[PDB]
C-alpha cells in the first residue's frame, strides 16, 4: 500500500 503514496 505504501507504494501508492510517497
Amino acid at each position: 500500500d505504501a507504494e501508492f503514496r510517497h
Partner: antibody
Framework: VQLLESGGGLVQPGGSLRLSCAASGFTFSNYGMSWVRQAPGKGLEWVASIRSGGGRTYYSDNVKGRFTISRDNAKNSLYLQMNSLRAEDTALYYC????????????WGQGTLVTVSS | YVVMTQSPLSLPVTPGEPASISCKSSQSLLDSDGKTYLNWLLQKPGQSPQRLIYLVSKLDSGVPDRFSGSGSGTDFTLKISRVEAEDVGVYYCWQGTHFPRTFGQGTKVEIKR
C-alpha cells in the same frame, strides 16, 4: 464494484502464464491496483502493484525480473504476465484495488488459481 | 522487512462474548505524514477477503460497530464486543506504512456453540 480474474491454470516449471482482471463498477483509471497471492492453506503475500499515473510498477523480491504487471485503462483491465514460473508460485492470485481516499487497499477479486507442476 | 505478528493464531469464543486479536509490527507504523496505516480484513469460509478497518480504528462500509480497532506504534488490537456466528473466519492485519506491504499470519476465529 467487481474485480474478475481469469487466466489461472496448470503450467510446467519454467513455463509462462498471463493473468487478467476485468474491473467494473468504478472509474478504473483513477485507482492504483495490485496482485496479491494466497498459497492454499496459507497466508497473504503481496505480489505486484501499479499506480494510476505513469505506468509506475512495484514488485515483491520473489518475482523481480519474472513477473510484469500492466494495465489497459481502455479495457478496464489489469494484467500479470508471469515467466519462469516455479512450484513456489503456486497460489490463488487476487486482483486488489487501492483506495487512496482511505490510504488502504479495499476490494478483492475472487482470485484465479495458478498451479505450477509437471 | 516489517514483520506482522498476530496472536492468538486460533481464537475460540462463546457467542455473545467479546474477542480480542493482537497485531504487532517489528517497526513503528507511524508514517512521516503523521498517519498510522494499520488495517484489518476478514476472510470468511469460501469467500474473498473483505476489509473491516483502516487507519487503526476507522470502520469500513457496512461493518457493524461491534468491531473496533485501537493501538499505535507497533502495538494494535481488533476487538469484537459481542461475537456473532457470522464473525467466523480468518482475520488478517496488514500495514500500509512501509514498502513492501506485509500481512499478519491470520487468526482463525471459532464459534463455541
Amino acid at each position: 464494484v467487481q474485480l474478475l480474474e481469469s487466466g489461472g491454470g496448470l503450467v510446467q516449471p519454467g513455463g509462462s502464464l498471463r493473468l487478467s482482471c476485468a474491473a467494473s463498477g468504478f472509474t478504473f483509471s483513477n485507482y492504483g491496483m495490485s496482485w496479491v497471492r494466497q498459497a492454499p492453506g496459507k497466508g497473504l503475500e503481496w505480489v505486484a502493484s501499479i499506480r494510476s499515473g505513469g505506468g509506475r510498477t512495484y514488485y515483491s523480491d520473489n518475482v523481480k525480473g519474472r513477473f510484469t504487471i500492466s494495465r489497459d485503462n481502455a479495457k478496464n483491465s489489469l494484467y500479470l504476465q508471469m515467466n519462469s514460473l516455479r512450484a513456489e508460485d503456486t497460489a490463488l492470485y487476487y486482483c486488489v484495488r487501492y483506495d487512496h481516499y482511505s490510504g488502504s487497499s479495499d476490494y478483492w477479486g475472487q482470485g484465479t488459481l495458478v498451479t505450477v507442476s509437471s | 522487512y516489517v514483520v506482522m505478528t498476530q496472536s492468538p493464531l486460533s481464537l475460540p469464543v462463546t457467542p455473545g462474548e467479546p474477542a480480542s486479536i493482537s497485531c504487532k509490527s517489528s517497526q513503528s507504523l507511524l508514517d512521516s505524514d503523521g498517519k498510522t496505516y494499520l488495517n484489518w480484513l476478514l476472510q470468511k469460509p469460501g469467500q474473498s477477503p473483505q476489509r473491516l478497518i483502516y487507519l487503526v480504528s476507522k470502520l469500513d462500509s457496512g461493518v457493524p460497530d461491534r468491531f473496533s480497532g485501537s493501538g499505535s506504534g507497533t502495538d494494535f488490537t481488533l476487538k469484537i464486543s459481542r461475537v456473532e456466528a457470522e464473525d467466523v473466519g480468518v482475520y488478517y492485519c496488514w500495514q500500509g506504512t512501509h514498502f513492501p506491504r506485509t500481512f499478519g499470519q491470520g487468526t482463525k476465529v471459532e464459534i463455541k456453540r
